[PDB]
């Protein structure tokens with residue numbers, strides 16, 4: 001008895017390599033004054049929450065805080081050019097503000113496609129046919145601060161701004177919010193999306209197919225309301241996340257043997 | 258209590274409506290090439306969706322005004338006794354637009370009609386758009402079109418399914434139909450009544466992405482790979498078990 005090469009409706013990505021793989025986290029809390037972007041209080045909670053959840057899933061987690069665009073590009077290029085032959089997959093998280101096709105580093109915008117492009121095909125051969133998962137918590141920073149240089153739990157509400165695009169074969173692009181909706185971040189507890197993502201990872205990450213888990217996150221986040229007492233006008237500003245999948249098989253994070 | 262395996266309730270009187278807008282020819286002023294093979298797609302889709310219990314309504318080569326009128330009429334009837342709604346576009350496209358016979362239409366205008374406040378009877382129900390649309394170029398022949406349509410999501414409980422993502426190429430056989438539609442329909446026929454729908458779509462991703470582009474009859478087409486994608490804002494598991 002063996003499996004002939006017949007089309008299998010339940011085929012899974014092989015997750016039995018020596019290592020789960022690397023999870024990069026790019027955490028941005030502050031920005032160069034010329035960008036006129038507001039601070040992102042609560043993002044450190046997001047970063048720490050994600051670090052614990054992904055590490056429990058077997059990932060080697062590397063966090064970088066407030067990198068300049070050049071440092072960011074350099075660092076992610078370094079990861080893309082080493083061998084991932086002994087890894088199951090790759091995860092990259094961006095926690096920042098964004099606009100259109102761009103995510104902000106500390107000092108400048110970076111095009112998402114340039115970031116994901118580094119892991120396409122034979123640019124990164126050892127990840128070909130392996131899941132490449134980008135998680136993006138990035139929206140429009142409320143620009144009611146000045147173009148000059150400069151502990152209550154507040155919920156900040158940001159309009160969706162980042163195009164929720166896919167990235168190539170075996171890429172999964174996960175977005176905190178879709179166009180027409182609003183992203184929420186609590187200044188102490190962190191972002192709604194990341195909080196809910198992390199809760200689901202801890203509870204179900206080790207058995208549930210990952211896109212099914214993401215769907216749970218869609219439901220959880222979309223069901224959140226702000227206590228209407230708090231101002232100003234977050235009433236009716238619903239958040240619905242989304243994911244764009246070009247995965248070709250089922251993705252599980254069963255505990256590694 | 259929060260249920261990790263919660264399914265959309267698919268036990269209504271009717272599965273729901275599946276609209277298909279099929280575009281084979283375009284007004285001369287648009288200077289767009291014909292889409293031979295698209296009628297095979299239409300028939301294939303009609304069969305698979307009707308087998309799933311859908312009430313299928315097909316429309317060929319509608320002008321933009323007629324198309325808008327039809328989709329608005331559908332958005333304004335009651336879906337209270339329906340499980341869900343499906344809308345398929347077979348045409349050329351560009352950016353946020355799909356072409357009708359005589360003009361472009363914004364996808365957001367199309368999907369917006371079925372959003373909560375516009376179509377109260379579809380609230381909390383799956384709204385699935387399937388889009389076979391790419392850039393029209395300037396015996397079974399394979400036509401190859403560059404991806405052109407932005408692969409965007411559409412709101413709560415919408416699922417947006419695209420034949421091709423940016424940087425890849427969409428293929429259509431003049432007799433057999435589009436690669437994407439063929440593979441989707443094959444999966445619908447084999448697994449549509451049991452498999453969770455996004456899981457089925459993932460199979461389609463695999464099938465289409467595995468079609469070889471090494472040895473084309475047209476040497477122009479070599480290396481022009483096709484990978485589809487889907488953008489999900491579904492909030493529950495979607496099945497089409499027999500009603």
Ligand SMILES: Cc1ncc2cc(N)c(=O)n(C)c2n1
Pocket residue numbers: 101163164165353407408409423
């Ligand atoms: C890749 C890309 N370039 C430009 C745009 C411009 C847009 N308006 C858009 O919605 N999307 C998704 C885009 N996506």
